[PDB]
Every structure is written in structure tokens, then in C-alpha cells.
């Protein structure tokens, strides 16, 4: 009798039990041990290398494992693969669709990812023997805007689309090996853990659901946010991750706690976050807000270590190298400022 | 070596920059356009009547040597708080509104709310909207047949009359023109409620005449860039 209402009541009581279990292990918080570590100070990073090669606004970027070649996406249909060490554009990939929202550099540097409102993840070969770049694989199985994607390897990647479901693709075959379904809102970003075994994806339902790339199911669901989680990044330790949403507050969730540990909020900044990345140590939380400035939040004291000047438009993409050497923040002014 | 791979990378960057400067000309030439609606609001008839043109994702047309990039969104999902932000550098947001579906759900109020969210947006606030009051061929008789009345979903119709600057169609009942201009002014109310001066609505009436519809888009985008440059030079 009344399967809908009864199942909704069981879901409500399960959520209440989960919240009670979270609060039971929440005797303290991340700010309760704030007196054990020294602060970091206002470290105002400067633009070491500027990248001005795009024609339209830059929506996505991604770093490589070599920490030298970075990729960036813009609505002009160009996927510029920059060289951060010498300020050189290695490739200018002519994209099939103009509007693109994702970027994913392969861990080996041979592949790269694309995609946007076309609902198609365009994989391009970089180290191919054919000279210029070309479409290495056409992942077309999503019904929503392909928001973000991450490169696990040259064989299989996972893309966060706008159809409320993510999917672990396969560059060898071209089909979704497993679909990550369960997000109530359209997914906006995903990030791979350093162990590459499990990933978390932040959607527009204030719930960054943690998935398992192996089993294809949702491990945990982190409902600590308030607005559309536009950005996400897994802590370099592999057991935690930060989230940037539209509520102007960043939150650092932990997989082993299933709840938020620190909420990076500030009354001076009311605009939402669409860029979140961690340094080599994870102490600095690079957070690209919508106020044309990226806030370097301290992941242990909940205080920005200095906003970033330069960009005059919304910074929708920001990423730190695999060794934390430099962070390249690209905004909607077709520019990429690499901070250090 | 010392200058072997570095010079190769520099010349590759130079070739890429040359290609990018060549593509910037056509990028500034192809004024991107956003074609959307409140759901089956007659946008398919607009894609059909646009240069006679991977399904409904993007169509391109060129008039007076001015090419355009009309990106249709007839294949995305209903939630539009993220993909609509990708149209921040877009030139014109062609809003195809079903002007006769006010009774059918109240699709007219849905289109009004969509236009309000597009206008007061944080990124779409600097972009005008080519309001295409589609389905006028049905509105020609929708108000007389009584099957779809404005007062059933808009009480301001009784307090509204045809404006003095109205341009009625030859052979139209005054009630039809009154309802059409009421929808136009109801859109323009929330259009001008922003008070920023960076974007203004371009209300047109389509689906009534089967002539070149992209000519209206051309004449609208012309004035769009006109007013954009005027605001840039503080002339308007």
C-alpha cells in the first residue's frame, strides 16, 4: 500500500540514520585541531606564464603528468595544448562542436579528451604518427551536456555528463563499460583519486556522490553542500576531496567519514565556485570563484591564503600539476594564468 | 639539444598562432546564436526555416556575407542552469516562444520564467535576446475560438491595451494584435526590469509568414552589435 510514500519514508529514515551516524563520529571537526599547525600567510602568487591563444571563453583545462603540457577548452572549437615551460601551443585541435566544457589529459600524454553540449566525448590522439591531431575515439552515449571527464588511462575514462549519470567509457571499444547512475541533478565535475580505483563526482544537487570505478556503483553520497557543485578535486592523500559549489562555500569531504570536515566560507565572497584543485600537499585548496579571482583556501584553517588578480572574467577552470609545481587558472577571457 | 627541439617547438607554436589568428577572423565573423525554447515551443519550425537546415545540435547560415552559428539545444536535458552558462560569449539568444500555448500547463509563463532567468543571469546579462513569438499562425484564431484565453493565465490582460507604437498585421482582428502585443510587453517588462543597458530584448513575431526568417535574425543581430558598440563607446 502506497509504495511511493512508504519508500520515501524508508528513504527519509535511512537518511536520518546516516546523519546520526555521521554526527556520532563527529565529536570534533577539522577546525578543532587548528592550534596544532602554523598558518600559511597571504601568499599572493604571480602570473609566471600567461597563455593567450584562445578566441572564445575558456571553460575547461587539465594538466599532464609531466607537469609541462597542459590542455584547455574554449567555445571557439579549439583545444589548445599549451607548453607551460616555454609558453608554446603544442597543438590546436579543431573541435567538432564549438561549445565544450571538459578537458582531460592522459596520464601518459598520448591522448586527450573533449566534449560539451554535443553530449559526445571527443578523444584525440597526441603522439600519433599521422602528424597532426585527429579524433582517436568518439564516445557518444550521453543524453546531457558532457560536463567534465578524467583520464584514468589510454584505455578507459569516465565522463560526467548532464544526464544525471556518469559513465566509465572505453577508448579501445567505444562504449560505456559501466554507468554511474544515482545523481539526482546533472553532474558538473568529477575527479580521480591518486589510487585511480574510485572516483567522486560533484553534481548540481549539492551531493557529490562517491563512485567505484571497478564495481560501477555509488560508494558514498556526500550531501553536505547547499548548491550546484560545479567543481571537485580528490585530496592528494586519496581519502578526501574538496567541492566547489554555487553557494560560495567550499567543503572538504572525507571518504572514511562520509561527511564534511571543513567548510571554506567567507562573507566577502558571495559568488559560487566553479574551480577546485589541490596542491602537491593538499594544504592549499585552489578555488576559482566567479568574482574573477581564484581564492587559495587553506585546507586546515578555512581561510584564503590570498586571492588571485589578473583574470577579469569568471574562472571556470583551474588545476595544479601532479607535483604541485604550478597552478594554471583559465577564465572566460580566453586567457590562462599559470600561478606559482 | 640547445636549440634543436626548442626551435622546433617555437616554430610549431608560431604555426599554431598563425592558424589561430586566421580562425579569429571567422570566429568574429560567425556571430554565435543560442536557439532555445520552453519545450516544443516551435523551435523545430525555426530550424526548418533557417537556410534549409548529430541531429538538432547546431545550424549555420550566412546572409550579406555575415555567417552565423545558431546552436540548437533540442537534444539536451530540461535542467538548464549549467549548459546555458556556456552561452556567455554568444551574440544573440534567439528565444523561440510559443506565443499561443498559454493555455497548454501554461507554457507562456514557463517561457516568461525562462526569459527572466536568462535576463537576470550572471553571465547572460550582457547578451540580448531575439524573442521569436512563434506559433502566430495559431494565435490568429486562438483568441477568437475561446479554447485558449489570456485571462485564464494572465490577469493583466484586462488592464492592457494595444500600444500606440504597435504595428498590426494587415487583416488581423484587434483582439489578436492585442494578445500578441500583450505577450510582447509581458516579456519586455522583465526585459527592461534589469536596468543595466548592456542587453535589450528584440521581440519578433514568427511562424505567421513563411518568408526568410534568418533575415529577421540578421536585422536583429545588426542592431544588437550596434547597441553593444554604442554602450562600449557610452553612446547608448
Amino acid at each position: 500500500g502506497s509504495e511511493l510514500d512508504q519508500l520515501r519514508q524508508e528513504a527519509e529514515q535511512l537518511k536520518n540514520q546516516i546523519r546520526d551516524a555521521r554526527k556520532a563520529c563527529a565529536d570534533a571537526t577539522l577546525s578543532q585541531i587548528t592550534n596544532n599547525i602554523d598558518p600559511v600567510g597571504r601568499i599572493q602568487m604571480r602570473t609566471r606564464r600567461t597563455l593567450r591563444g584562445h578566441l572564445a571563453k575558456i571553460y575547461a583545462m587539465h594538466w599532464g603528468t609531466d607537469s609541462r603540457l597542459l590542455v584547455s577548452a574554449s567555445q571557439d572549437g579549439k583545444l589548445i595544448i599549451w607548453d607551460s615551460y616555454t609558453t608554446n601551443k603544442v597543438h590546436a585541435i579543431p573541435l567538432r562542436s564549438s561549445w565544450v566544457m571538459t578537458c582531460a589529459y592522459a596520464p601518459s600524454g598520448n591522448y586527450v579528451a573533449c566534449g560539451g553540449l554535443d553530449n559526445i566525448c571527443s578523444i584525440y590522439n597526441l603522439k600519433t604518427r599521422e602528424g597532426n591531431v585527429r579524433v582517436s575515439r568518439e564516445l557518444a552515449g550521453h543524453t546531457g551536456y558532457l560536463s567534465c571527464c578524467r583520464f584514468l588511462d589510454d584505455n578507459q575514462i569516465v565522463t560526467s555528463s548532464g544526464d544525471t549519470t556518469c559513465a566509465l567509457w572505453d577508448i579501445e571499444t567505444g562504449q560505456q563499460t559501466t554507468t554511474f547512475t544515482g545523481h539526482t541533478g546533472d553532474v558538473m565535475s568529477l575527479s580521480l583519486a591518486p589510487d585511480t580505483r574510485l572516483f567522486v563526482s560533484g553534481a548540481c544537487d549539492a551531493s557529490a556522490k562517491l563512485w567505484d570505478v571497478r564495481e560501477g556503483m555509488c560508494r558514498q553520497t556526500f550531501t553536505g553542500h547547499e548548491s550546484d557543485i560545479n567543481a571537485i578535486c580528490f585530496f592528494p592523500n586519496g581519502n578526501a576531496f574538496a567541492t566547489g559549489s554555487d553557494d560560495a562555500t567550499c567543503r572538504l569531504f572525507d571518504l572514511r567519514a562520509d561527511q564534511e570536515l571543513m567548510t571554506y566560507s567567507h562573507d566577502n565572497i558571495i559568488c559560487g565556485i566553479t574551480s577546485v584543485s589541490f596542491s602537491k600537499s593538499g594544504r592549499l585548496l585552489l578555488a576559482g570563484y566567479d568574482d574573477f579571482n581564484c581564492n587559495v583556501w587553506d585546507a586546515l584553517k578555512a581561510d584564503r591564503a590570498g586571492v588571485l588578480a589578473g583574470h577579469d572574467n569568471r574562472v571556470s577552470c583551474l588545476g595544479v600539476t601532479d607535483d604541485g609545481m604550478a597552478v594554471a587558472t583559465g577564465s572566460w577571457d580566453s586567457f590562462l594564468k599559470i600561478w606559482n | 639539444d640547445q636549440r634543436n627541439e626548442e626551435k622546433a617547438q617555437r616554430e610549431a607554436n608560431k604555426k599554431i598562432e598563425k592558424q589561430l589568428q586566421k580562425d579569429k577572423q571567422v570566429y568574429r565573423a560567425t556571430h554565435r546564436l543560442l536557439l532555445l525554447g520552453a519545450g516544443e515551443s516551435g523551435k523545430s519550425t525555426i530550424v526548418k526555416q533557417m537556410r534549409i537546415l548529430t541531429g538538432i545540435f547546431e545550424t549555420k547560415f550566412q546572409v550579406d556575407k555575415v555567417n552565423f552559428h545558431m546552436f540548437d539545444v533540442g537534444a539536451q536535458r530540461d535542467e538548464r542552469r549549467k549548459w546555458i552558462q556556456c552561452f556567455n560569449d554568444v551574440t544573440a539568444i534567439i528565444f523561440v516562444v510559443a506565443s499561443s500555448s498559454y493555455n497548454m500547463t501554461n507554457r507562456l509563463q514557463e517561457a516568461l520564467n525562462l526569459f527572466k532567468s536568462i535576463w537576470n543571469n550572471r553571465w547572460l546579462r550582457t547578451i540580448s535576446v531575439i524573442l521569436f513569438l512563434n506559433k502566430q499562425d495559431l494565435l490568429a484564431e486562438k483568441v477568437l475560438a475561446g479554447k485558449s484565453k489570456i485571462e485564464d493565465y494572465f490577469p493583466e490582460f484586462a488592464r492592457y491595451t494595444t500600444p500606440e507604437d504597435a504595428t498590426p498585421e494587415p487583416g488581423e482582428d484587434p483582439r489578436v494584435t492585442r494578445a500578441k502585443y500583450f505577450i510582447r510587453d509581458e516579456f519586455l517588462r522583465i526585459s527592461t526590469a534589469s536596468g543595466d543597458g548592456r542587453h535589450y530584448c528584440y521581440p519578433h513575431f514568427t511562424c505567421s509568414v513563411d518568408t526568410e526568417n534568418i533575415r529577421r535574425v540578421f536585422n536583429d543581430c545588426r542592431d544588437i552589435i550596434q547597441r553593444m558598440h554604442l554602450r562600449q563607446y557610452e553612446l547608448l
Epitope: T164, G185, A206, E226, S227, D228, D246 | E79, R81, R122
Partner: nanobody
Framework: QVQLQESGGGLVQPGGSLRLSCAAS????????MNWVRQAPGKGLEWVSD????????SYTGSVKGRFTISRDNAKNTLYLQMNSLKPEDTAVYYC?????????????????????RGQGTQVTVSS
């Protein structure tokens, strides 16, 4: 968790009065442009009312303009929809769809089902 529980509603007489108490917990209620949407049996989700972050930009749809009355309570973190002079077309499940982006006058919460920051749904019905 962004949860919205709409108390009240039920089955009343057409033309009477009704008040919905939407419990807005899990977010800063005084910073989101909370609004009201309904879903009639067989009809899609249509926007009903709206109120600003502080209560200035108050707007309703044409079907409830003048009849309904919205009032946000930033102290109690709840959204009220005072329904007056109901109509037979008010047979719908009223949802508490919230503006996702705070400090903004824009949101697309008039979307179809499976919306994130929407109420759980109260069955507001009228007799005949």
C-alpha cells in the same frame, strides 16, 4: 542535505483558503530566491509564485496572481504560500523548488521532474 518539507495542504473546498508551510532546512534560507511550483495530474511542472532573498521581488503566475500570496520567513527558514480564493484548476502537487544559485535573480527551477532543490510535494486538491 537540501531538504524541503511542505506541511499543510490536503483537500479543501474550491474558493476557500489554504496555507503551505515549506520547511527549508539544510541551507541559508535567507540567501536563496525560493519559489513555488505545482504539478497537476497529467500536466507538467508549472511555476506558481516566487519571492526574493529578502522578500521584495514577489511575483506569481497568472493563474494565481492576486489569489495566492507568498511570504518567506528568514528567521524560521520556511516558505509560506497563502492560497486564497482557490479554483478547480488548483488540483496539483505543489513543490517548493528553490533557486540553486544564491544572491542571483535567476534560476531554472521550473524544469521537469527529478529536480534537485525541489520540495517533496504536497497534494493540494480541491473538491467538486
Amino acid at each position: 542535505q537540501v531538504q524541503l518539507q511542505e506541511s499543510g495542504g490536503g483537500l479543501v473546498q474550491p474558493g476557500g483558503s489554504l496555507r503551505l508551510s515549506c520547511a527549508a532546512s539544510g541551507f541559508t534560507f535567507s540567501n536563496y530566491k525560493m519559489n513555488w511550483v505545482r504539478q497537476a495530474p497529467g500536466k507538467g511542472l508549472e511555476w506558481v509564485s516566487d519571492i526574493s532573498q529578502s522578500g521584495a521581488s514577489i511575483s506569481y503566475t497568472g493563474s494565481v496572481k492576486g489569489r495566492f500570496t507568498i511570504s518567506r520567513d528568514n528567521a524560521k527558514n520556511t516558505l509560506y504560500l497563502q492560497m486564497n480564493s482557490l479554483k478547480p484548476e488548483d488540483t496539483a502537487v505543489y513543490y517548493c523548488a528553490r533557486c540553486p544559485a544564491p544572491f542571483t535573480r535567476d534560476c531554472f527551477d521550473v524544469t521537469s521532474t527529478t529536480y534537485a532543490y525541489r520540495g517533496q510535494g504536497t497534494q493540494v486538491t480541491v473538491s467538486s
